[PDB]
Amino acid sequence: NSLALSLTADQMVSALLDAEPPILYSEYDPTRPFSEASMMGLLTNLADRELVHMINWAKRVPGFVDLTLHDQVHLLECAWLEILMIGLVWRSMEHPGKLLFAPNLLLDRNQGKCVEGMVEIFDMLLATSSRFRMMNLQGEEFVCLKSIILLNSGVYTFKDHIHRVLDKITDTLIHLMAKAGLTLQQQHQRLAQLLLILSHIRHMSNKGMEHLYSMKCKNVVPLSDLLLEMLDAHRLH
């Protein structure tokens, strides 16, 4: 039996907040403007470092370590880019029109143009950030949604344990909305609104994975072995 299922909503919220990874920095070199290679270099260097922390974070999501190693690997391979993306959108929420990749790497859509095929993805991420801002997404809700992505994205390409944990996170989201003073109708509407955004996050990840694959093939820049392995899990080749 899994300890995760015994947690109260408050205990779940505190555990997820405690598990949060740090905000990392990019390079301090202020050379502008970027080139396609220098921008892809900074973004992939950052992603690689964030992945190490993401793995540590996942082990602290209640219920995750009750899974076999194989199942843990599957979920992270499926969700890693969705998780990087929702994190980016969250960081960016208070910066309309910009993407806060790092505190010293805040980019606008025009800088997206530096890389072939990138501005379309920037536009999607910016729209998601705007939607979260207009919804006044709270930090407690964000950590719930991020854990939902981890547990859900790979669950149909494998069970009951994962679904039971997902149910616990749903209970926790509803608890937060009740605590914020929403009516019952407002709670279910908001729950729906948030989960529908996850469909868009999946779409962005699929587009982003194809983009990264194209960069690998063009030999644009050197990708870490870890990043290559996470990309290779998606079988674009």
Partner: peptide, 11 residues
Amino acid sequence: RHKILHRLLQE
């Protein structure tokens, strides 16, 4: 299979 992901998950 050897995977960096395995190593990280087992730390």
